[model samples]
Target: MIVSFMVAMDENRVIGKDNNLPWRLPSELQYVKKTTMGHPLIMGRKNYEAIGRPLPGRRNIIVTRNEGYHVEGCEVAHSVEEVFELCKNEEEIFIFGGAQIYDLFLPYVDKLYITKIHHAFEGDTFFPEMDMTNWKEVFVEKGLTDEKNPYTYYYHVYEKQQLVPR
Candidate 1:
């Protein structure tokens, strides 16, 4: 199985604040919903709780320390490894966000779809910084939206580069 992340960020790498998104870009939201609609999505408990319910049409997998919370259409796993075991044979899976979750699985992800929202905000949540030394930009689509959000946004993809054996 391959793990991927679908995220949007600002120039300052801000992703969210107060359990909600820092920005409201409907087009970007649609992009994520469309791409991940029928797939399995793994995220941290905080993110799942923040969402409040199962995301329709997707298998919602949450990694949480708590063992007793159950909701319709969601499953809780104990660890990241268990997350993989639970989804070991799927063709593809997406690791949706909440900073701690992203930080934990960043190394295991094979691909990233990042929407570079062109402004920064006072956000408490952040996307993990990719070590540019270990990643290579593979695709970019600049100026994809013309909404009233007061900033430009672009979509980009990055592939993790394998380290050369010394």
Candidate 2:
């Protein structure tokens, strides 16, 4: 299975504030939905709670330490390995996360779909710092700042270079 990570972060690596996304970008939101529409999504419980409900058109797998925790329309896994087993049959699995979940799966990810915002923000939560040497940028699409969207950003797809046999 191909495990991918999808995240939106600022120039400083900030991802969220107060358990929610810091900025609003309809284009990026649509891009996520379009990209992971048919795949399985694995997220930490806090990340799942932030959304408040199951995302439609995807298998929702929650990773949490709470043994008794359960949510409607989702499967619960206690560890990243369990999440992998749950998504074993999937062609592509997406990690839609809070920081912890991202950290947990970063070592195993095959690809990264990151939305890089040009501006920095004050946020409590952040995406993990990546060693860019390990990843090769495969594609990037730049977006301009408009009246509705305040900051310039680009969607980037990076594939892990070492994961493929060379």
Candidate maximizing TM-score: 2
> lDDT per residue, candidate 1, 31-133, as tens digits?
7788787789988878877767777888899888778866667888877888998998888888888889888887688888888987878888889877777
lDDT of 2 at 15: 87
Clashing pairs in 2: none
Residues 1-166, candidate 2: write the lDDT tens digits: 8989999999988988999888888877878899999999888988888888888998998999999999888999998878877787899999998899999987888999999999978899989888989989999999656877788999999997766576
Residue pairs whose backbone atoms clash in candidate 1: none
> Candidate 1 — which residues are off by over 4 angstroms?
147-150, 162-166
Write down the lDDT of every candidate, Cα atoms only: 0.82, 0.88
TM-scores for candidates 1 onward, in order: 0.89, 0.93
Give model 1's TM-score versus the native structure: 0.89
Tell me how candidate 2 scores on lDDT. 0.88
